[PDB]
mmCIF file of C-alpha atoms and ligand atoms in Angstrom:
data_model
loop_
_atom_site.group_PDB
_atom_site.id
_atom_site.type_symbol
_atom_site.label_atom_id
_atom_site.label_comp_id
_atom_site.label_asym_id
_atom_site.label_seq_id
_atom_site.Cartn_x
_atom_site.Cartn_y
_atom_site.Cartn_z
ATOM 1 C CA UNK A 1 -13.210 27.972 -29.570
ATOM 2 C CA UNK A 2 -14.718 24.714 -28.696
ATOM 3 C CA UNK A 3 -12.087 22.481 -27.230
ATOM 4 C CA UNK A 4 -12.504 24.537 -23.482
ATOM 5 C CA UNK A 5 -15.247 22.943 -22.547
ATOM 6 C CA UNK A 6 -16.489 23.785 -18.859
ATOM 7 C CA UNK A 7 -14.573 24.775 -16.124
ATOM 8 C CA UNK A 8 -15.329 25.366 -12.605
ATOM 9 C CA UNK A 9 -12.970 26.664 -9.741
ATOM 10 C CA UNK A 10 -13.489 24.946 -6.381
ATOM 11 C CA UNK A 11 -11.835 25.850 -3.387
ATOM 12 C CA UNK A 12 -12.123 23.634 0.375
ATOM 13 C CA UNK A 13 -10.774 24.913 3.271
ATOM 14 C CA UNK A 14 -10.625 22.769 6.876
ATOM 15 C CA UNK A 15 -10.910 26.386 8.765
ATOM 16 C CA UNK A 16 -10.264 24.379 12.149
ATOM 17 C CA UNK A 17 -7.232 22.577 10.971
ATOM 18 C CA UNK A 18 -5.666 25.432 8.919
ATOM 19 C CA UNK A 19 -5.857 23.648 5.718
ATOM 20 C CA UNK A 20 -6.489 25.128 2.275
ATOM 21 C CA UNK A 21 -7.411 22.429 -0.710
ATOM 22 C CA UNK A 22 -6.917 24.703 -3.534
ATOM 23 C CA UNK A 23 -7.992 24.298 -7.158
ATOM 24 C CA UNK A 24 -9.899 20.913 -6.514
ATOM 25 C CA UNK A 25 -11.870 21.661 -9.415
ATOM 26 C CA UNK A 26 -11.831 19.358 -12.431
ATOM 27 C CA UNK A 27 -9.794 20.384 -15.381
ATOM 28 C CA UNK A 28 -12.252 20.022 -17.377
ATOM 29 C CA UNK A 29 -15.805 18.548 -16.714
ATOM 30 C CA UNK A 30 -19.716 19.899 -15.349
ATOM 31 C CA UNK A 31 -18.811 17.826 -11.907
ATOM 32 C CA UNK A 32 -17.191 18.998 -8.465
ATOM 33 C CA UNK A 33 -16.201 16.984 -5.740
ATOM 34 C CA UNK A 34 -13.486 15.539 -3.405
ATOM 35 C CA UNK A 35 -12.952 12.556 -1.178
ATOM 36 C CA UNK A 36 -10.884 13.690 2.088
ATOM 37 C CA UNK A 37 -9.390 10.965 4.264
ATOM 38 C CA UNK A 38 -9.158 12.063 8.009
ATOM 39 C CA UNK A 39 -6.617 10.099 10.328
ATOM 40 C CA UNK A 40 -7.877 10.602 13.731
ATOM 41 C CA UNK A 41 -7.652 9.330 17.250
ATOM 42 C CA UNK A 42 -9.939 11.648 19.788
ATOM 43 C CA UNK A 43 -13.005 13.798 19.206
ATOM 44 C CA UNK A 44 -12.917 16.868 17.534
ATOM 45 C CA UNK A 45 -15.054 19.271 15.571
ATOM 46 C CA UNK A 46 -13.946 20.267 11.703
ATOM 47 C CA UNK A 47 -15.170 23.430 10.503
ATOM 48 C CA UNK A 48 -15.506 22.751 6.449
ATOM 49 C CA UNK A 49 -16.092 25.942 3.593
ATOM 50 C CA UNK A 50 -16.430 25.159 0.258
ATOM 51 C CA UNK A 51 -16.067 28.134 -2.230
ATOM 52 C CA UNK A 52 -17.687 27.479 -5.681
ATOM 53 C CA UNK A 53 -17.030 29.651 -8.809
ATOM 54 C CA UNK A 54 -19.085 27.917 -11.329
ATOM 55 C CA UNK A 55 -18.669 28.387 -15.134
ATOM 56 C CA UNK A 56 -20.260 30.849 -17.114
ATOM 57 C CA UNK A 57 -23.317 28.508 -17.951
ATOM 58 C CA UNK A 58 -27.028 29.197 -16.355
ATOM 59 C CA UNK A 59 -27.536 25.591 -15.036
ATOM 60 C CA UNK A 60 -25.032 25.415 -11.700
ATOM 61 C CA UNK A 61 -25.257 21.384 -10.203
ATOM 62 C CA UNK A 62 -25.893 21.828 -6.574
ATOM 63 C CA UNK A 63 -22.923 20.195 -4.575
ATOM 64 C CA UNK A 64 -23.429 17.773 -1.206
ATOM 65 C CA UNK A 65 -21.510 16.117 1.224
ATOM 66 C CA UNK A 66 -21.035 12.378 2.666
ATOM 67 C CA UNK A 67 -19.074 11.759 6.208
ATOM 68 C CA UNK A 68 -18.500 8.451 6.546
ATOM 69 C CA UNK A 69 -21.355 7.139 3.539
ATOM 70 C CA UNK A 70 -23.913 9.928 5.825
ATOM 71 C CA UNK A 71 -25.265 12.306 3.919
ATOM 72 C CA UNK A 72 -24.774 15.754 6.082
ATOM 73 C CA UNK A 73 -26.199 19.182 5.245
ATOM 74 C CA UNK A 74 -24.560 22.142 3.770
ATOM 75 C CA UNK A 75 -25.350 25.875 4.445
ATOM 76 C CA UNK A 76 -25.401 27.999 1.841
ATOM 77 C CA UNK A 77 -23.786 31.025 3.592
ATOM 78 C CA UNK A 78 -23.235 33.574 0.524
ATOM 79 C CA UNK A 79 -24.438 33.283 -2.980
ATOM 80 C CA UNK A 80 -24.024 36.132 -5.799
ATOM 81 C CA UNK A 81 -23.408 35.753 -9.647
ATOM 82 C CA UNK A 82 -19.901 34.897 -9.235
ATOM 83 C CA UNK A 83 -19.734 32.256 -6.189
ATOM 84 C CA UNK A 84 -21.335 30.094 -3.825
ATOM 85 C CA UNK A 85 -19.894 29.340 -0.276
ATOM 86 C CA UNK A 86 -20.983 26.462 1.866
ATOM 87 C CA UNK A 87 -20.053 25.517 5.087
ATOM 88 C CA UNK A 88 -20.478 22.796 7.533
ATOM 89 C CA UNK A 89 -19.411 21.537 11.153
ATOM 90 C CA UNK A 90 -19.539 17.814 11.694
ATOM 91 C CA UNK A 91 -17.852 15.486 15.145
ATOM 92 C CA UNK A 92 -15.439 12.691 14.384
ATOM 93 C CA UNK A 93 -14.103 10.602 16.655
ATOM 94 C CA UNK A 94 -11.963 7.809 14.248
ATOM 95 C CA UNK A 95 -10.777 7.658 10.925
ATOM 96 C CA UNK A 96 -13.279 9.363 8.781
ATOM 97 C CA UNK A 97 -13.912 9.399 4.646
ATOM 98 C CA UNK A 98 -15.576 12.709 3.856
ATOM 99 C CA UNK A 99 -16.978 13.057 0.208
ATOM 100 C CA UNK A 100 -18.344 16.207 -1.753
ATOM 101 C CA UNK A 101 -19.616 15.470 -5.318
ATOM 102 C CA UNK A 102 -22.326 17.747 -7.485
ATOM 103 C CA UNK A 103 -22.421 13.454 -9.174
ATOM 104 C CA UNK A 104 -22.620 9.869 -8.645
ATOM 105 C CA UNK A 105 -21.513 8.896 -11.954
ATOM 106 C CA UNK A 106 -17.658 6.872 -11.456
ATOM 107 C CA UNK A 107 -16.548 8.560 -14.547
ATOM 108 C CA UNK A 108 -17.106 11.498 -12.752
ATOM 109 C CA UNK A 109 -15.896 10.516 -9.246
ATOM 110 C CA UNK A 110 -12.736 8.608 -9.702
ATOM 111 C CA UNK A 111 -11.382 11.949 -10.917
ATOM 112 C CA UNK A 112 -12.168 14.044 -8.049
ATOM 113 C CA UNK A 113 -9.095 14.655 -5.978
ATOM 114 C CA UNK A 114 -7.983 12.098 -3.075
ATOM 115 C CA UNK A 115 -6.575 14.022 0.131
ATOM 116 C CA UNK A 116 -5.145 12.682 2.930
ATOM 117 C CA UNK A 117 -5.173 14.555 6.323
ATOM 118 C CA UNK A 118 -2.909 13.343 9.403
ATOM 119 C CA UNK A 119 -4.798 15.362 12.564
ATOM 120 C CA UNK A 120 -2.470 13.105 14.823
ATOM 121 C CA UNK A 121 1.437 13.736 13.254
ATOM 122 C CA UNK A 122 0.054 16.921 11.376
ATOM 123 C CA UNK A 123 0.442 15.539 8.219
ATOM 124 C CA UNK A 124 -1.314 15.868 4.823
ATOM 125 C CA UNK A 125 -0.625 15.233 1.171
ATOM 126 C CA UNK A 126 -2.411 14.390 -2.332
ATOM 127 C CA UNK A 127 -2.998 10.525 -2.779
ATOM 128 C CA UNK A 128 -4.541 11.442 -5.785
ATOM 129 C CA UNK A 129 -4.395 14.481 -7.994
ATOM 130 C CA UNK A 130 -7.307 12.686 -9.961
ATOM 131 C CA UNK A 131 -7.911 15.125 -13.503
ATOM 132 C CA UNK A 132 -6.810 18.262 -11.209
ATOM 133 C CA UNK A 133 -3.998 20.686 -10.556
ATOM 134 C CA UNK A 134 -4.791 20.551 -6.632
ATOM 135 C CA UNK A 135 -2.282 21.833 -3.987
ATOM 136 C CA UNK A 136 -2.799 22.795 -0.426
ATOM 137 C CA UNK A 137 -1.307 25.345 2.222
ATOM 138 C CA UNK A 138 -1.009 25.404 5.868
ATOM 139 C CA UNK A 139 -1.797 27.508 7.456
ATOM 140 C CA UNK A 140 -4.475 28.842 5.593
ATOM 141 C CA UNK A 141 -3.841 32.410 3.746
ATOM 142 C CA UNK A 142 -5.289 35.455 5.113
ATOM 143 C CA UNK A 143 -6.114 37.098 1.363
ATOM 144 C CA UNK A 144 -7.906 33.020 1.070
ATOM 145 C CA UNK A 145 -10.200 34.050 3.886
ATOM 146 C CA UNK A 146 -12.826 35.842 2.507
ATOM 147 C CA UNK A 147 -15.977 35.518 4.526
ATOM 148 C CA UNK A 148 -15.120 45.811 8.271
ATOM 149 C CA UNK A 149 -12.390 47.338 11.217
ATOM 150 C CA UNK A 150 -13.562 51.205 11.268
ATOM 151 C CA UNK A 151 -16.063 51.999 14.190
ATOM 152 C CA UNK A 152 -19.757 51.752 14.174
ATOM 153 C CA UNK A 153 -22.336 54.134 13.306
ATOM 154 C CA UNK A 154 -25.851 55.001 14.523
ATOM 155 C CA UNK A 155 -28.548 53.719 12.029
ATOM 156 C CA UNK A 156 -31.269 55.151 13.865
HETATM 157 NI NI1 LIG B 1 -12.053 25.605 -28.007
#
């Protein structure tokens, strides 16, 4: 009745490293966000989508992103009633900290999840579940990848 309070689904996906972050929404809370730690020892380019389901209120927070403490845009690539998905492509060439919060409040932050990616020994893991059910999945799962295979047709 009450006790529910408000509760987003948040989905990240590292499209260029086959990575799915699922269910990195808070349990409970109006906040969204994650800290990903990248171990990395050459250039490359990582292709981030967020998906966004927001609760059922008419006020959504708008969510950004930090790479290394730099503030870096996010496209908005699709937005309807249900769901918002963002995207970005950033450079990295060493061991990289990026964070998305819709807050700056630490009693909102320090329970965002804490992920760890290895692009070196293809390792990742949870360092901190924070006040989430996370998980992740590599590769990433075709029925996940939702952002057509019949032939065209002449519109004039
Ligand atoms: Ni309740």
């Amino acid at each position: 009745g009450s006790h529910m309070g408000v509760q987003h689904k948040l989905d990240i996906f590292l499209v260029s490293e086959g990575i799915a972050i699922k269910e990195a929404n808070l349990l409970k809370g109006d906040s969204y966000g994650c800290t990903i730690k990248i171990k990395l020892d050459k250039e490359k380019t990582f292709k981030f989508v967020i998906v966004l389901e927001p609760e059922w209120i008419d006020e959504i927070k708008p969510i950004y992103m930090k790479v290394n403490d730099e503030s870096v845009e996010l496209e908005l690539d699709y937005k309807d009633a249900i769901k918002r998905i963002y995207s970005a492509e950033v450079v990295l060439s060493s061991d990289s900290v990026i964070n998305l919060f819709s807050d700056v409040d630490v009693s909102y932050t320090s329970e965002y999840p804490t992920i760890k990616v290895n692009t070196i020994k293809k390792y990742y893991s949870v360092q901190n579940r924070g006040m989430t059910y996370v998980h992740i999945e590599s590769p990433i799962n075709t029925k996940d990848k939702s952002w057509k295979n019949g032939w065209y047709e002449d519109r004039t």
